[PDB]
A paper describes a structure:
CueO plays an important role in copper homeostasis by oxidation of toxic cuprous ions to cupric ions. As with all multi-copper oxidases, it contains four copper atoms distributed within one type 1 (T1)2 copper site and a trinuclear cluster comprising the T2 and T3 copper sites.
The asymmetric unit for the MDM2-bound form comprised a single binary complex with the scaffolded PM2 peptide adopting its prototypical α-helical conformation. The three key signature residues (Phe, Trp, and Leu) projecting from the outer face of the helix are accommodated by discrete pockets in a prolonged hydrophobic cleft of MDM2. Comparison with structures of unscaffolded PMI, a related stapled derivate (MO6, differing by one amino acid), and the parental p53 peptide bound to MDM2 (32, 36, 41) shows highly similar side chain conformations of these residues. The adjacent MRS residues Met-396 and Asn-397 extend the PM2 α-helix to more fully occupy the MDM2 binding groove. The PM2 conformation is further stabilized by hydrophobic interactions between residues on its inner face (Leu-393 and Tyr-390) and Ile-358 and Met-361 on the α5 helix. In addition to a polar contact between side chains of Lys-94 of MDM2 and Gln-365 in the α5 helix, these interactions likely drive ordering of the MRS linker residues abutting PM2 that are highly mobile in native CueO. The MDM2-bound PM2 helix is positioned well away from the sCu and T1 copper-binding sites, permitting unhindered access to Cu and syringaldazine substrates and resulting in the observed MDM2-dependent activity gains. In the case of CueO-PM2, co-incubation with MDM2 resulted in ∼1.6-fold increased kcat (and no change in Km).
Residue numbers in the entry:
A (entry chain A): 31 to 520
B (entry chain B): 25 to 111
Write the structure that this text describes.
Amino acid sequence: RPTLPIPDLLTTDARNRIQLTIGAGQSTFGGKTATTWGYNGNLLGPAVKLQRGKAVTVDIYNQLTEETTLHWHGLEVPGEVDGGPQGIIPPGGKRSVTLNVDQPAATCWFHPHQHGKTGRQVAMGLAGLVVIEDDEILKLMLPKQWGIDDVPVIVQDKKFSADGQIDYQLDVMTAAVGWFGDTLLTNGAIYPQHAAPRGWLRLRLLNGCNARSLNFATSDNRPLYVIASDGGLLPEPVKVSELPVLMGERFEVLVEVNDNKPFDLVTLPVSQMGMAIAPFDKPHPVMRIQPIAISASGALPDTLSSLPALPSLEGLTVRKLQLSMDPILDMMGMQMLMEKYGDQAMAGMDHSQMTSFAEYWALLSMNHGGKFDFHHANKINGQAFDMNKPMFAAAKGQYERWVISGVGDMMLHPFHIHGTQFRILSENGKPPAAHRAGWKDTVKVEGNVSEVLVKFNHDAPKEHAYMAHCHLLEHEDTGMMLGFTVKDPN
Amino acid sequence: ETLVRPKPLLLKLLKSVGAQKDTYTMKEVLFYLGQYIMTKRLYDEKQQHIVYCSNDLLGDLFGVPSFSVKEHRKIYTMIYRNLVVVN
């Protein structure tokens, strides 16, 4: 097995500014050469060590023939730095931002964020981690040896053409169920192998698939100890037998290495439309851990951090967002899927869900024009994305109850809100799981309703607006996303 | 919107459910037609995008014994054959 790659950790130079170049180039998957992209690389980019309260500047240089963005997924920073409208870097271009970090130590990432292009630009290889350190977490004595017992694990699926090149297509099927493939890339590698000390192994897991949700576990069923979520540490470690992770979410887990017993990290088959076709019908290996006589470094504390109380939940401005996949898109996408893969497709959510004759006929009558441009078929609140109108203005420094509905379709909708770390009160109609009570920047929405308590501490204008979107990328690209603004009330 | 005149046999099928007019809008035909199918059991209880008209008057109208309420443009072309568009 090939040895797992470790993204270069990236602090500042004499001038506290990090340099990131957005290039293309070549990578090799199972001996077939493909064209891939990357931040300071052929592939996937680096880990940007940031230090809370101490700011740094980032020059972003774009050596693609085409344009792209750079979203700091998980950061509490003004809508300026994201950019939004005219936050676009044109080919050969420069952009410079400053990141004054103010949020607890956390494992965030960055990825291209342009409505219409995110799906493909990500699929190409653009990704990259941000590692935030505060003083609290250093005083903690977690495993700290980057690339040894503290390991980024970026897990992604891709599909490849006959050529060995990446095969993306934003057709009506991938706009419906997502772009998903058959080859699983752990930090870019296929089934790599990592060499761990005996002791605790810290793994910063990141689901970077386009639509594929993952569900981590170990080949031999040792528990994973979750110690942090999207936005930072949990209060105490949550012991779990399996860890489902959605697109763009991160969890830092600890695992125990004792004997020379090797064992794989695996992702278990998941109850999601189109994600339990072979080879993901069965448990699938993410990477193999092999223990050797390397130095260990950390412990599994019984407390990790303090977490503030929640403010009384009335008086709080409340906003309902209702996600909606245009029903024609659903019917059609599922036809493409039910043809291509037999009925091994819907396996996992395959049961009594049906659709009446009256619904079918009302669908017929409704697109009498035969005008069905599926590039706006996904909507929040009834209308798809238009950069022109931020949907609303929410208050700075103020607590608010956002309620995201997803009733009417059974399509997974991991829902992302920029410029904040928030807390989940309801996640798809149930109270959040023990480890998703933390800080999160993504919420499951699958046929039901979630409610999050959110507060933005950073200004964002119509010019550079915050977003909110499904992080199933092909949904975000085909309309399921809005903008919003935040300013200190006049 | 769009206003139309049902050719004879379609008009016949249209009044079997309670229509009375001689010149309808499109949404009006779609309504009464779906009403006809759901009154005469014509869909299959299990797969109910599937309409079985072989032995019915609708079978002669459309010229088939079956069709699927998913193939929209096809069912529209069958509908428009028995129409005279007035605009």
